[PDB]
Amino acid sequence: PQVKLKEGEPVDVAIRRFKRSCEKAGVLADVRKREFYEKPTQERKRKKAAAVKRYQKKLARES
Amino acid sequence: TRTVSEGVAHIHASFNNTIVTITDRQGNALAWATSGGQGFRGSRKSTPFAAQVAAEVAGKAALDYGLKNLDVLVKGPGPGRESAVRALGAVGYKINSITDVTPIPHNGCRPPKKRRV
Amino acid sequence: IDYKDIDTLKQYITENGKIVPSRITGTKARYQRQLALAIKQARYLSLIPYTD
Amino acid sequence: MRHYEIVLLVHPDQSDQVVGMVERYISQIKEADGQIHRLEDWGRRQLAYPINKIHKAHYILMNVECGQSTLDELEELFRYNDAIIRNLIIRREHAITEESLLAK
Amino acid sequence: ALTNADRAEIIAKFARAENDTGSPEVQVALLTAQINDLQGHFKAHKHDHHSRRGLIRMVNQRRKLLDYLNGKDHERYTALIGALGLRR
RNA sequence: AGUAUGGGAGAGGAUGGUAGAAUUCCAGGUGUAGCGGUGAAAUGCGUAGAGAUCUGGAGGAAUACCGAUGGCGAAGGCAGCCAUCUGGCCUAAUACUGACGCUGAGGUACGAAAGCAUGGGGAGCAAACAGGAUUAGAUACCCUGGUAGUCCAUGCCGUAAACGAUGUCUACUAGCCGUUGGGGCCUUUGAGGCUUUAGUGGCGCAGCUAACGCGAUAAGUAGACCGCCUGGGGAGUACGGUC
Ligand SMILES: NCCC[C@H](N)CC(=O)NCCC[C@H](N)CC(=O)NCCC[C@H](N)CC(=O)N[C@@H]1[C@H](O)[C@@H](OC(N)=O)[C@@H](CO)O[C@H]1NC1=N[C@@H]2C(=O)NC[C@@H](O)[C@H]2N1
After folding, report:
1. Which domain range does residue A48 map to?
2. Residue A59: CB atoms within 10 Å
3. N or C: which end of chain E has fewer CB within 10 A?
4. Which domain holds residue D86?
5. Domain locations along chain C
6. Residue D8 lies in a domain
7. Which of A15, A36, A46 to mutate to test the interface with B (most CBs of B within 10 A)?
8. Chains A and B: how many Cβ contacts under 8 Å?
9. Within E 40-79, residues with CB less than 7 Å from strand F
């Protein structure tokens, strides 16, 4: 992140630029994933469902 | 007694508690307050309001050491990070930077088992 | 790609130092594999940082 | 034989010794057999991250062609020499002679 | 491993004609050389089963070609097994 | 069906070395009352100083991002980087052998995880077990700990919803839209468009099916060989035998 703040930037606006920086980074998603161990079977099922959803989205947006 | 002008604010936010530690640069601690200290026992530790109160207390305590501009680092998920950093600014500090430093393994140790609730 | 091509490597690296996925930059798969290998070799050689 | 590309990182305090070691490595390669197709000295570069609490290092780039015994000897020398803090060895097809980037 | 020169020497020695690379003699000689070469590898890498599968395939192919040559011409079969040292 | 020669992609296998992040422990600097945990709590840790924060050490295990309805392998399976040894596959055109083929009862090789034997290792996790909760009871789900094991070397065991619940090989039968590795052709300066081939996906005509559905990766149309089924329980059990 390293959100450095300008002379005219208010404290609240600086914090807002910050949560956008961190939401773009998506570190909290990794933190959520790390907290409990997920079995390889469940991981494979999750990725399979994600791929199916991505292909459905592609088809829907194309037509 | 010792006078410092620049400082660092460490926010340890979790799903259970928030800890605010004010250090000088080079990491030597000056003041610290947590949601547990200001009442809010048990489940009440994790609310953003308790984090705001703890951050205000820590900033007021560091003002005696007398530093005016600080750099904040946020480590951890959970409520209270944004409220705590807002409270530090509302005390009268000038925040110089704000960044996330939560540790992320490169697939290291195995996490605990999933809870079946 | 080659690992000494540091500016081109930085073209495909975010500000955290993470590698950008192919879906975002429109890269070909074969070119992306070489780019990732070059990035890892440069990281080991310390021409670009691992993190940050 | 086979073609290899070698990158050496040298402690800046011992940069005065780089010429001697590179001459002796090239001499070993030549007396055994093979060629040197590229020698480059990138100079005193800053590191992206510290290695053994050091922030700068001397970079040497070699493109050579040599045999298995020579490769083993060079690896042993790089391992046991203390001026060398990191080394990378990469097999290549065909010999590269053109002046690389990062030479400056 | 064997090189192009080594393979060319075997092909030249066992060739039955000009540019003959497909005869059972040439094929069996090439397979025998490769099998004898790989025994050094499998001495130091005893637990490499994935490559041992390919080695077994080479052995089976040599056996099939030897049986075919024995069926076609017995004299050529005996000459080839004698020249290569195979027991059968 | 196979061989020689050029070129190409790959987490295919075996051995050794090495890099960065993180967890745990140890020592030290700052510093002072909590920390941790839950639905709420408690067991537990802390004024011989915890938690937090900074610097430095020790050790083990696993490789974020790339990452993909992607890739490789007979299957089981295979992901940081580098070197060494090594198997298969794809692709072009010539040259060569001349049916050398397909399948396969017995047999034999490999074969997740757990488990066993001998010797090492042990960070994290965690059967058994201990304590705290919940409950009418709780032997469990939740919480704090924690041994075998998970890791390495050398062997054994031979079982999984080992699944596409779909044996292997061959030929033929509308089309449309993706994607991976190659070959060819065309535009015209560099990126696009047509084809062709080997994989991997989504629809879908005919045909098939009890229906669901399958539909050139068939469960369609045919041929070769093998394995298996004959109501539900008793029962993959008893006796005998092999290991
Ligand atoms: N030449 C060699 C090539 C080898 C390679 N294998 C290629 C090949 O040969 N393929 C053959 C296709 C057969 C296929 N396996 C049968 C099938 O697909 N379902 C089994 C029939 C059950 C039932 N009659 C249909 C059914 O319930 N459907 C569901 C359904 O649509 C949907 O579920 C929900 N909740 O809405 C979806 C989302 O999960 O899941 C499907 N279920 C599944 N989708 C999976 C899938 O395709 N595979 C693996 C497994 O996971 C499959 N189950």
Report:
1. 1-60
2. 9
3. C
4. 1-93
5. 1-52
6. yes
7. A15
8. 61
9. 41, 44-51, 53-55, 57-58, 61, 64-65, 68, 72
Across the interface, which of A19, A25, A37 has its CB nearest the CB of B110? A37
Please list the residues that pair with D43 across neighbouring strands: D59
Q: How far is CA E19 from CA B88, E3, E12, in A?
A: 87, 19, 9
Strand partners, D86: D9
DSSP D104: -
Instruction: Record the tokens describing residue B44, joined without a space.
Output: 């009440």
Whether there are 3 or more C-beta pairs closer than 8 Å between D and A is no
Q: Residue C23 Cα, ligand 1 centroid: separation in angstroms?
A: 27
* Structure-solving method: cryo-EM
Q: Do D46 and D83 touch, CB atoms closer than 8 A? A: no
Which bases of chain F come closer than 7 Å to a protein CB? 2-6, 9-15, 19-23, 29-42, 50-56, 60-70, 73-76, 80-88, 95-101, 109-111, 123-126, 141-143, 154-155, 179-182, 201-202
CB atoms near residue D73 (< 10 Å): 16
Quick check: D96 and D63 in contact, CB under 8 A? yes
Q: Tell me phi and psi for residue E75, to 5 degrees.
A: -65, -45
Residues 6 or more apart in contact with residue B41 via CB below 8 angstroms: none
Query: What backbone phi and psi angles, to 5 degrees, belong to C7?
Result: -65, -45
Dist CA D91 CA D65 (whole Å): 10
Domain count, chain D: 1
Pairing of strands D2-10, D54-66: antiparallel
Q: Is residue D100 part of a domain?
A: no
* Closest CA relative to residue A2, chosen from B52, A17, D8, A11: A17
The DSSP result for B10-49, as a single string, is EEEE-SS-EEEEEEETTS-EEEEEETTTSS--GGGGGSHH
Interface contact C50, partner D, CB < 8 A? yes
D21 in a domain, yes or no? yes
Q: Which residues contact D88 (CB under 8 A, 6 or more apart)?
A: C41, C44, C45, D6, D7
Resolution of the deposited coordinates, in angstroms? 2.2
Q: What is the DSSP letter of D83?
A: S
A35 touches strand F (CB under 7 A): no
Distance (Å) from CA D51 to C1' F18? 14
